[PDB]
Symmetry: none
Subunit: 140 residues, 14 copies
């Protein structure tokens, strides 16, 4: 009867329980996307000031008229912004990301909301994370 505990090692000890690791990066990394949306927020306000008086988008470019210069959540490899765009090239492990957040602005039209553009080229599941954060849809 003593042999059975060795057999449970042959199988039962190998429960192989594990968090699905690729799913795990999907979640915290998605948080990096969402935290990036938080990085987008101050830009939403300063761009509203560009809407407020400057009369056009070049004033809306980051790094000017008091707009904050774009900058990384530390895990991210890179970022850039102009006209309020957040083409986050170099995002996290997220190669090829670029939320081409084209501004919706033209004041006589009344247009305003930024045009989101998912662009996570490195993997489609990551795109499931963008639709779940920076929706590819253009209303903001």
């Amino acid at each position: 009867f003593t042999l059975i505990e060795l057999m449970v090692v042959i199988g039962i000890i190998a429960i192989l329980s594990a968090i699905g690791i690729p799913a795990y990066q999907n979640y915290l990394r998605k948080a990096a996307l969402t935290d990036m949306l938080q990085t987008f927020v101050p830009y939403r306000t300063a761009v509203e000031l560009c809407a407020l008086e400057h009369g056009g988008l070049d004033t809306c470019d980051g790094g000017s008229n008091g707009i904050p210069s774009p900058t990384t959540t530390r895990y991210v490899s890179a970022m850039s912004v102009a006209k309020g765009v957040v083409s986050l090239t170099g995002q996290e492990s997220l190669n090829g990301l670029s939320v081409v957040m084209t501004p919706g602005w033209d004041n006589a039209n009344g247009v305003t909301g930024w045009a989101r553009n998912c662009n996570i080229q490195s993997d489609s599941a990551l795109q499931q994370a963008c639709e779940d954060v920076f929706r590819f849809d253009d209303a903001n």
Copy 2:
């Protein structure tokens, strides 16, 4: 339970609260119209002097017999005046504006009030602003 705050970012953080920006230009720009009515006022007085003695409208043309030369609130692209008319071509972002403020004058008749004429060709909502400032109606 920790996932819910990420979900509030999926929706609640996007309150998307905003002043309706096109409505916003309608209000300050309407103020540019009304400030223009203030620009019209000194002309109403000098034109009354034209009524006072000159005996006819050419004397009422701006830039003469002491009448002030017409000039822009600084946002406005352009203006012109003659016979007391304030055809504000080039108004603000208000393309096509021209308050054809034809004078009502002929002294034997006793006629006096200027003939307002809304002419904001660029958008009808802007016309709601003219009716709300320079009424299209002719009594003044």
Copy 3:
């Protein structure tokens, strides 16, 4: 609350206070009529000299026997006189005026007072001014 001052411009600033201009011309122009009665006065005296010795009206015609030649208050377009008549054709803005001031003279009769005749054909309110100056009534 800030919107209300713009609303007072929508209405209260347009007090549209004004002197009734046609009434205004009625008053100063009536003064031109009355000043014309003053122009009539020297003629009343020289015509009395015609009564004084000449024995008839042709001597009473203006421009003769020392009578002054008829002449305009400067605003007036025209005038004429004969037998002491002051048919002020061309008066002021007063088209059609003619105070047919026919002399009342014939000395054996004892008649003397000039026959006033309102004749402001251009407007009836102007006639209210003549009754208020050169009364249509004939005693003088």
Copy 4:
């Protein structure tokens, strides 16, 4: 901690700041009363002409002896005048108004000032506006 911003919407977002709207109509409408006093003014002058020579009030009735016919500030529903009275029935939203501005005239007496009479039957606060414009008191 994220829940608090939703709570500020439960209360703080409902600042419910507002101009007291009924007070607002009290002010611009009071301006309609005061503008009406301006409408009364030309009548004060023509009635002075009635005092000037006609010798009695029927001549003072509006629409005659050159007096202007009574007429509305455009918001007003109605008006009427006789003997210089300004019983503004139909005023603005001001139902029941009638400033029974009875003339004070009788020249041998030396009496002149018009007898004001507040009569804003539709609401007492409106009467506060009449005392603040057309005082119920009779001196003018």
Copy 5:
């Protein structure tokens, strides 16, 4: 409305009422002529004494046989007399005057009345005054 009183100064205050001054000198100066006829009167009497006995005109010359010496109403610049003549050179402002009052005398003929002669060379209206005083006609 306040501007109108300034306008009445623009016109009504300039009533420009005035006595016609040249006519005024015509009247008092004519009185100087007539007063001169009064100066002529004592001479008419003393000349009648010359008719009375002396038998001819040299006795009629002024300043002799008790005749008064000729002399000025004080305004007059000069005078002279001989044979009863009153050639009033230097009269008043009346330059060139000379009533060549030639005597009509020759007693066998029965002739008597002085020959008046208007001679107011300075202006014809003054001559209207002489015909109205010292008639150019010769009967006296």
Copy 6:
């Protein structure tokens, strides 16, 4: 002793920890209600303009006099507005919702605040969310 870890799977591994999911929809969905109150806000302003001059509610109906046309937070199945009402039929998963936000307006009265009306017919807990957002009470 080896058997115990299998027993912990019989019970302890089934911690069955979970966010209470129906409570979870209550929270984000409540946010959809509150975001809807944000959708109500621009309408509160344009309706104030209807209060501003139009003089009555038909002008207050959405889609007119510059009022925005009603429209969905994207999760919502449907919406409608008239006289400023926000009867959000089709809200979210919120079947039967209709905030019958009847306007409180009549300016002579001074009345203004919108009449809220909870109407989440699909479940009473959802009504706890309406009282917690669009209170059934009528002050706004």
Copy 7:
């Protein structure tokens, strides 16, 4: 939405309404001219007395034969008069003014009216005020 009231301060609060101040001095100062014509009036009468008997203009000089000495409306810097002239050097803020009111007198001619002469050297708009008061034209 709170930012808009700050924006109305950026523009609407700067209505910059103002009476045109240079026009304002034109009006009250013109009144100083007209009041000066009133100062001229007593001189018109005493000069008529100079016409009345003295026989020439030196008697017409101010400060003599009972004529009032010339003197300032208090705002005026200076004045002078001779032969009835009103060369108002130093008028008000009106540098260079001098109404060279040369008398029209010579009694044998019948001439009388004073020769007005606008001379407001400091600015041409002021000359518009002289033509509107002391007309440059010579009849009075």
Copy 8:
């Protein structure tokens, strides 16, 4: 702009137009002098009767030989006469007046005209009125 009418009250309403009052008394009072010359006239006739037969001046004293007793124009404070003298002490407001109208009479000499003597001690301008009425010169 409303402030300007208050400013016209600050200056323009104070036209301070006025008849020069001291000049006014000069004119009517001068008329009292001239009316006094009319009072002198009947005395000129009765004194001529004194010349007519009495042979000397005591008979010429007023109040005798049918001469009228001296008496006041009612405004005058006092009067007296003797030998035809009209020393009008107490004249009008004319303190110190006394026209010492000494008679020129002595019949063998042929002398006749009364010796006028201006004596208006109260003011020299009044003396301008005496030279203009009772000339200080002695011919009458």
Copy 9:
């Protein structure tokens, strides 16, 4: 700050400047009295002719021996005359007036001046006008 102009209407616009109208009738009506004295004048002359030869007053009654029949300045309601009396019943607005101008005549006495009698029964201020025209005193 905008409210102040409305306040100036509450008070400053009501300057209530006016000629004192009852004083105004006092002046022109007094002129009607004085013009009536002018009407009295021809009667003074014809009555002097009655003094001239007729030997008594019935001849002095108006309407006879060439005396003019009495008649109204047109504003006057009525008049009558006898023995030179001017009891102007019905004068102007001057009810009760009657200048009982009784003649002073009786030639052996030397009496002549008419006996004035103020009798303006309608108001005492009017009597101030009679003392200022037809003095109640009897000398003329």
Copy 10:
């Protein structure tokens, strides 16, 4: 970020904009002074009548010889007049006011203009208003 709107209430909502209220009373109250000058005007005319014939100031006292009795603009607490003086004790909120408008009259002197005397004892800024209305200076 939500906290900032509460902070703007901590400061920006307290714009504390206000008309400077004490300055406001200075302006309308100054108008009460100026309206008082208008009350002074009829008195200027009746006092001119006192100058016209009465010969001295007691006749100039108000309430007599037809002068109007003194009376309040309704806001004023009190007034009095004698010899044409307008010592407006009790003026408005203007405690201690008294324009001791002593008449300048004595006709032999030719003096006429009333002696103004600012006397607003309650505050010096009010005195700035008197110098700006009833100047302390004595010419009128």
Copy 11:
């Protein structure tokens, strides 16, 4: 190794994360204070009308001369107002609150700003909220 997850429940699961609840009431309740300042605002305007004409504070008491009656943000237990005071007894959970907002008014002084008075007796931290809203300082 399996025991460790139970140990994390012994400690790590008890993160005890929480919003500091008493701080939470401090914030929304402070908003109730600030919303109360908004309730104070309409009263600031009507009290300015009390400043506008009534002349004293009793007219400034709430519930009169058109002032709104005081009333609760619904969470508040009670309120009262007089002379513009906002002694908010019963505020929220804020026992003992009373912003004794004594008016600063006395118009001759020019004083205006309301005297704030923090009075949150229930806790000092609440007083930190009053200094952060209704500052204890008196300028408004």
Copy 12:
């Protein structure tokens, strides 16, 4: 030698190795306590909502205002909750258990943490398990 294996059965085969069974129930049952703390957790959240707005504990009672009704891990014999209390009577084999989790709430105080109360009456070793799970200490 063969007898020895029988002897090892006399002793060695009776190794009597065993998990200490009472210790075993201590561990899994302790897990039932800890799982119960997990059952407590949703209640911690809903009670926080009771803290969120209801203002007191009755709203905090389970089974109300959306709070979950209390319920058993299946091994447990019974449970109950009120005011957030988790007096788990009938726990597991744990007779007498009752974690009298009295809420720490009173918001003005800022108090919040639940008052734990070990109450495993059936055995003290079980109490070692409560101190190791639901600590008797009151902070939560």
Copy 13:
């Protein structure tokens, strides 16, 4: 799997969301600038009175001729004014600020608008706030 929540603390809990604080001071401080423009406003009016009569700028200096003495919004460290200048040295945290608001005045020129001068030496972004409030441009 339990380790992941600790990892979210390693990153996700550090959302580091924050209002950009330096931007925050830019906004409320800009409000201090704009509130300062409100402080400038009463000075704009009193300086207009300096334009009104004083004739030059020294009268325009603050603290005189009734102008308010300059004073701080309480956060400001310092201020000064002369000739209407608002060189706000010591503004807020705004070191080096000085809006050298030189007056545009010289009345014969018609010049009026104040010369703004941004001078926020402490930081250029603050200058963006001045251009957004007190524009460096000189028209006002």
Copy 14:
């Protein structure tokens, strides 16, 4: 063959399986660090209030201006805070710990993030836990 089971006890029974205990303390203790970061969080908020208005760090010190007093997760031996610092001396078994969390604040600079400082002096592996929780890096 029976001997082998005794031999498995000689080796196989000594599996010596064990969680690496020092690693175990590293994990739960790291949780004590992370829970400490949670303790840091309320301080992050109150310090943001210090940023909010106080203007400097002393107000940011814990235990003041409403900041919570610092306090231990119960395992910790000690803690302290000032200027927002969390120098956790006495942490857990973590001797020498002190996260010198120096605040990053100076508002004109815009600086904000707290300066983390790992300081786990007792062991370097513990420092691996600080880098994994309170990173030595200074951004927060």
